[PDB]
Amino acid sequence: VSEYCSHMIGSGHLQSLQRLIDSQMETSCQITFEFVDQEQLKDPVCYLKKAFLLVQDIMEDTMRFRDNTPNAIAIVQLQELSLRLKSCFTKDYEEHDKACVRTFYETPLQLLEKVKNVFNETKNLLDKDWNIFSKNCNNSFAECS
Template sequence: MNTHKQSHTFCKAKAWRQCFSLMMCFHVVLGDVPGPCKHSVTKEHLQNIQGLIDNQLQNDCSIAYTFMERQSLSKVCYVKAAFPQILELLKAHFQYSPSSDNYRYVSTLKMLVLNIYSHKCIPEINEEIEDDPVRFAKEYSSSRREAVGKIKKVLQLYMELMTENNKPVDWNCEEEYAEDYPELTTALAKSTGPTSGITADLLDSDSDRDSGKAFRNGTRGGSHISYKIAFITASVCGGLLLLITLYCFRKQKKLKALLHSSKVKENQRLTSDSKDIEMQDYEITEQSCLDST
């Protein structure tokens, strides 16, 4: 009986281990933060931004610009709303000589933002289902140092979103953008919105313009591609789930057959042992009768 129990335990553990491995594979396929997005902002990028901050004059003249105020927005929706304004701010107030360190810092920062959009790490605001978050925009008048500090905070929040999650970020902000907050600005033109703000006129160099063109081509028809990707992902996940179910069902049948076979063999062994004992008892009895006669 001990052999039967050990066999049962071993087979059951083996089946569950294999099913668990398949379930882990299924979890990986279901989704993780894409590699290009998870590592799109690094500590080196933040150091470059800090270099741009350090190179600003302590007593610089104030600049006027528009930037998002977080208010009650979640981290996700604030980053999504503020990201397009980074390019506008850099274009309007951070122009330097091509041979300077500041020019290199600004160019690197522009390319970083464009790459994040081109890899669809942050989707553009879809005004068909989301309101333009212009109500959260605020007019600021501050030093360039403080303005770049706001950009750095947005990138730090984005970096946290990419590293603290084990699954893709849900960028749906329809409810948060639709909430009826008091207007903070008088009349901010639609051109300050995320969709129209990310255009080639925000770029200084030829390489920036090429990147902007690639970005526009990549985002055109993005909604259609997203639906296709969602359909393909759902199909793959459904197929994997079916395979896992069939695999576990097959393993369960094999386990039951193995246990039944073990039980039959155990019963046969016990029956054989019982017969041997009866035969020995009969022989002993017969011998006793012979001896007595």
């Protein structure tokens, strides 16, 4: 039922994301976080679908910056953007909640690289076909764990 999603993700959103990554300091540090198991859910249509729903909880638990700093602004914009997009995604069966997901013990630099990739890959699939995220992934979500 979603219309106009194609250009929901402006170029200016992704601009800040790379700025987020460029600004981060190089460190040997690692941290744990939930994310979609790219191997349990191979299909890139349903991967981005599932992965997207979880992002809302991630950004809050993960990407935290000092209030009203250049980066925190970007983060709120991305949550802002995220909320409008929930309408472009058709909800699926509730039993599938918290499946197709795994642990990752990686650098923040890596984690941001994973999130930028979700947004950027979604933009490419929205640009090509806007209504694409309506596909019923209940079939694909059973397949993981």
